[PDB]
Amino acid sequence: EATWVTDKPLTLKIHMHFRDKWVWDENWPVAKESFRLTNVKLQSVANKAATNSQEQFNLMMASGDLPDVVGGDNLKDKFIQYGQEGAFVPLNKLIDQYAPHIKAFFKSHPEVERAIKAPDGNIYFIPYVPDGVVARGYFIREDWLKKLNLKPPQNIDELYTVLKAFKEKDPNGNGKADEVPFIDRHPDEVFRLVNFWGARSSGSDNYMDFYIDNGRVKHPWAETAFRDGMKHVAQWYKEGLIDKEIFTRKAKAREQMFGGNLGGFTHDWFASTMTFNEGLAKTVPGFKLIPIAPPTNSKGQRWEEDSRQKVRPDGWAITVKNKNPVETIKFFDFYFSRPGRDISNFGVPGVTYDIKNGKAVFKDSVLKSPQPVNNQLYDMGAQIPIGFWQDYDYERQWTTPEAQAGIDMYVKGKYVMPGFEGVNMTREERAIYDKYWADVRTYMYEMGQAWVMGTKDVDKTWDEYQRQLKLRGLYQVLQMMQQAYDRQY
């Protein structure tokens, strides 16, 4: 083909483990199409049965028989760290000489290129570049509001009242107290509930991210506002307003809790969450989620903390052991070209989409399925966190008119907080970040889970928490980031 990057079929070994559940699959329809178009085939050497993607990365890197390519989600920091240590090769020259689509992309998106570079100036991975503006929003069961003769909640006091009514007043009508007012497929969203009491939970679409407040680098989970917000979240969990299994239900929470007519309220992405309106029309009579503006928080503001990232901390890299770096960067380049963006965004021609008027258009069966289109695509190897350039037109096609009115409402309302994009640390500053931040984050999450589940009291353990943050190096990390901030700005 005209899109081939090599004349002889080339097989590369990839270690890709993502979202704690999935691996590259050469027998994916999209992987087969990838091979057809590029003449490069990726063979997985990852453990399909393993259940923690970050631990699989760590194991593989420690094991001495490195693959040719490493890919996955939440690997930016490790791509940079181990790139500098020489396990991943710098891509700057390879891109300049052999990857015209990536080169053009970075030229038009210099902020993205700057955001993925290591302190030594090297590019150690090609990223997942999202396309879009908003990410999550709030959704509530309008049919339950109607049955209970309640209005959509305008503020946090009204939200509490409405969730309490969902809990206590049997809106699914079975005479059982089985309603679970707040559910979420991302456990981390339980902490984002602190927004309703004027506390940040994150500076970005990455959970538990740093943020900038009045020229100061802060971590949201270290602030007293977070302490006070978490007291409210713990009380909601105690009262059963939050899914008891919020920390373990995970990916199919909507299918289980909306499909089972148990859930009343969530914070999740506009396109896929609103698909459940048509998806459940048959099996759950009357089901209707509506987007609502964030209920006014305790400080008088409507917050949407989440936003679409300019670039995600995901993608793939070329290892030092890869004997075909030129073919590999050309293969990478395919996913920033139109033919490669088609399959990585839309799937396989004649299976999920067709070219019509020169553009990829999803088939009717795809657009009508109760399964959200991005889930359909995951199952065949598209919309996966390789290095690729996402195309928002894929998403437009299954964004319902009602979902779009929600998006436009959030844009017009200016609810969406601008995200933290990072600071430009030196090698020595980032080394402190590398030393401490993962340990701190793990400690934070464990404490937060205990607070939510009520096994630790927030007020009674806050001093210990702060002592721990200090001896685990959080404030050293903040110091380093503040230094980088002060130079930058």
Ligand X SMILES: O=C(O)C1=C[C@H](O)[C@H](O)[C@H](O[C@H]2[C@H](O)[C@H](O)[C@H](O[C@H]3[C@H](O)[C@H](O)[C@H](O)O[C@@H]3C(=O)O)O[C@@H]2C(=O)O)O1
User: How buried is 245 (Cβ within 10 angstroms: 0-12 exposed, 13-18 middle, 19+ buried)?
Assistant: middle
Q: Does 178 bind Ca ion (CB under 5 A)?
A: yes
**178 annotated as ligand-binding:** yes
**324 annotated as ligand-binding:** no
Largest CA distance in the chain: 68
Q: Does 169 bind Ca ion (CB under 5 A)?
A: no
The C-alpha atoms of residue 184 and residue 256 are separated, in whole angstroms, by 11
| Helix 100-108, helix 325-334: angle, nearest 10 | 60
Stretch that binds Ca ion, among 127-135, 162-170, 207-215, 296-304 (CB under 5 A): 162-170
Q: H helices then E strands: how many in the chain? A: 21, 15
**176 annotated as ligand-binding:** yes
**279 annotated as ligand-binding:** no
The C-alpha atoms of residue 419 and residue 296 are separated, in whole angstroms, by 20
Our CB check for ligand X shows the closer of 272 and 352 to be 272
Stretch that binds Ca ion, among 25-33, 55-63, 176-184, 431-439 (CB under 5 A): 176-184
Choose among Ca ion, ligand X, none what residue 147 binds, the Cβ cut-off being 5 to 8 Å by kind: none
Residue the block writes with tokens 């998006």: 407
The contact set with ligand X (CB under 6 A) reads 19, 73-74, 269, 271-272, 312, 374, 383, 395
Q: What is the 3-state secondary structure (H, E, C) of 429-483?
A: HHHHHHHHHHHHHHHHHHHHHHHHHCCCCHHHHHHHHHHHHHHCCHHHHHHHHHH
Our CB check for ligand X shows the closer of 25 and 395 to be 395
Choose among ligand X, Ca ion, none what residue 97 binds, the Cβ cut-off being 5 to 8 Å by kind: none
Structure tokens at 190: 């339980």
Choose among ligand X, Ca ion, none what residue 176 binds, the Cβ cut-off being 5 to 8 Å by kind: Ca ion
Stretch that binds Ca ion, among 14-22, 157-165, 168-176, 363-371 (CB under 5 A): 168-176
Q: Does 176 bind Ca ion (CB under 5 A)?
A: yes
**132 annotated as ligand-binding:** yes
Residues in the chain: 489
CB of 321 to Ca ion, least distance (A): 57
Our CB check for ligand X shows the closer of 322 and 383 to be 383
Among 174, 301, 365, 442, binds Ca ion (CB under 5 A): 174
Inter-residue contact 290 to 142 (CB < 8 Å): yes
The C-alpha atoms of residue 14 and residue 318 are separated, in whole angstroms, by 10
CB of 73 to ligand X, least distance (A): 4
The C-alpha atoms of residue 228 and residue 197 are separated, in whole angstroms, by 8
Instruction: Mark the binding-site residues, compressed into ranges.
Output: 132, 170, 172, 174, 176, 178-179, 435, 439
Instruction: Mark the binding-site residues for Ca(2+), compressed into ranges.
Output: 132, 170, 172, 174, 176, 178-179, 435, 439
The residues binding Ca ion (CB under 5 A) are: 170, 172, 174, 176, 178
